[PDB]
Amino acid sequence: MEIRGIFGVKVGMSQVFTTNNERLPITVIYCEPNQVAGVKTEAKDKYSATLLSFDTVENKKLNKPQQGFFEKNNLKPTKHLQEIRNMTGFEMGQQITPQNLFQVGEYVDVSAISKGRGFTGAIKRWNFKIGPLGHGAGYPHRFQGSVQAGRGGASAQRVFKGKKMSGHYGHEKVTVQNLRIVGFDEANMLVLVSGAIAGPEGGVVLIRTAKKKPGVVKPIELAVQTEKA
Amino acid sequence: SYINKPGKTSAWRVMTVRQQVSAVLAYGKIETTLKKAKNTQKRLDKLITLAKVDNFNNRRQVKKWLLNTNLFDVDQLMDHLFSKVAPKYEKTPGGYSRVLKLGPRRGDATEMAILQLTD
């Protein structure tokens, strides 16, 4: 479908209190207005996509071909450029803000680069188990179990492709789906998203229309205080 | 291997920092490994900036770090500091010491550096 998307950063995580009197955890996303830079039309190049440019920066802090592209296209220089598949209803050079794309409490999903953790063990990676600690189970007892598949020339004589062992973990794009929007703040270029947002604070976060539930909305109001003394 | 050296425990680390900052106060320059000067500099700067008041409480706090040296014992080192070193730095906001790099040693190729302080 005609996917809606927008880019921002992650500045922390907090909570807010809503009607029905439940504590809702909140991630706060500083979403500076993006700027379309290319409209990939179905006719021109065999698919429909739109390219966003965000994280505006000074002209000097930019490579020469990139700055030349920006000057020739008559846009504002930005550090990052990315495109979203199946985004149609926008034209070149039009500024976009998250309030122009979303309701106050409808359904969106979020994809962002995860938090790196370096080379890690198998158990901490694949959620394996740990050999016994009593009765003297020997020293190599934090390992991925037996990788044996078959002993003898007939059976396997190898270790199968796509095994589960230790390796680099994290710092990879991940996606959490069906995270409700909670509120906007046009004054500070700010949006509110329920749930937990992947990635370390200060990174780059992407927001898209949820694929599982495109237009579904279950609105949530606030719980403005009534305590005075 | 089961038995081993005590190694670089937190107490050893902080005591080395104490010794090096005391030596810097005594003389004004040290030829030590770069990745030790880069740590000593923090306590050096904190002690220098703390000693710009000369109240008894600040001298008590300084007592927690200094160690006597061949040139100056601890009390004489305190008098030296609070009488001539701190007055020299009464208007420089932070950054009282510099850490420049030497060439590697022939023994270990470690990168010696000079922890030095001046205006």
Binding site: - | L100, K101, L102, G103, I114, Q116
Partner: protein
């Protein structure tokens, strides 16, 4: 765990192909003529235009 066949003189060279060295950045110190390695002090006693040491 021991080698079953002799590792030949070809595999050893292939492995040691990456064991080569590289030169460190070199610069000419000012106020005095020598080739110190960059971002360090020369034996001349000058780091740029500043006093950090004795003569040598």
């Amino acid at each position: 765990a021991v080698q079953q066949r002799r590792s030949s003189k070809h595999r050893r060279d292939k492995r040691r192909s990456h064991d080569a060295l590289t030169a460190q950045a070199l610069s000419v110190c000012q106020k005095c003529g020598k080739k110190k390695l960059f971002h360090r002090v020369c034996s001349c006693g000058m780091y740029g235009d500043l006093r950090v040491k004795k003569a040598y």
